[PDB]
Symmetry: C2
Subunit: 153 residues, 2 copies
């Protein structure tokens, strides 16, 4: 199917990406992980997102998440994500075509009593997908949790 006009501005996402990231947070010593993301579509105004992470040494599975990105021609976007840990997120924000960036903040975090807000920001940098995920909790203001850079395969 052809790319829907609402998806076309984010067509640079479509494909598979692999790289690595790092986590850290006040309660949590730093950790590293491998990551793969696939963005795909079926001609609708939606991009399917699927992700997985693993241990760098061994390739042992860690976590997974999946969901859907819904861009609109005014530059707005909403994203819904379910995670293997049992969290869900409703993310809303904007994409910028000149910067090839997407900036999202949660409207809702479900099933995760301690995390309050989550933000996710993506940017294409020299053709690589970078992101930052920030979390807040009741006692920790919004701050980085995860950062990763992935190459397009």
């Amino acid at each position: 199917p052809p790319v829907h006009p609402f998806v076309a501005p984010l067509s640079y996402l479509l494909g598979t990406w692999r790289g690595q990231g790092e986590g850290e947070y006040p309660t949590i010593p730093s950790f590293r992980y491998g990551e793969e993301i696939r963005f795909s579509h079926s001609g609708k105004p939606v991009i399917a997102y699927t992700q997985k992470t693993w241990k760098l040494e061994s390739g042992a599975p860690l976590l997974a998440e999946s969901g859907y990105f819904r861009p609109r021609p005014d530059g707005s976007i909403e994203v819904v994500i379910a995670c293997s840990t049992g969290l869900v997120e409703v993310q809303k924000g904007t994409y910028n075509v000149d910067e090839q960036s997407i900036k999202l903040k949660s409207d809702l975090v479900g099933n995760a009593s301690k995390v309050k807000e989550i933000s996710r920001e993506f940017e294409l940098v020299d053709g690589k997908l970078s992101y930052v995920v920030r979390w807040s909790t009741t006692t920790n203001p919004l701050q980085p949790l995860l950062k990763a850079i992935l190459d397009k395969l």
Copy 2:
């Protein structure tokens, strides 16, 4: 990877399923659809769920959803689902090993102002996967929306 002990009681789900369903609701004339579901795992206490639907005549894509099922040895289960329409659900309930059934009710429906609660009930019937999805809205009490039966491939 081997099946995690918490997933083993739901091992009958693992695989791909294809069949058809029907929708209907007070505001909505009846419609039919084809459906495919895949349940998979990576050795963790989680089953990945992915689903899609299509028009019966043509195979044209309709909707998609995906998420994660987290069974526990006491018979409890939580399920998180993101949908291509932009909804998210946190489902909680129980599974019954003798009946090969799973019965879920939403704790949370996100990003869908009019739908209030969603229930999902699965049952293996002569080896086929059947379900019923019920919805409530502010003015319509919980009642069937979708029902489908799928054969294991």
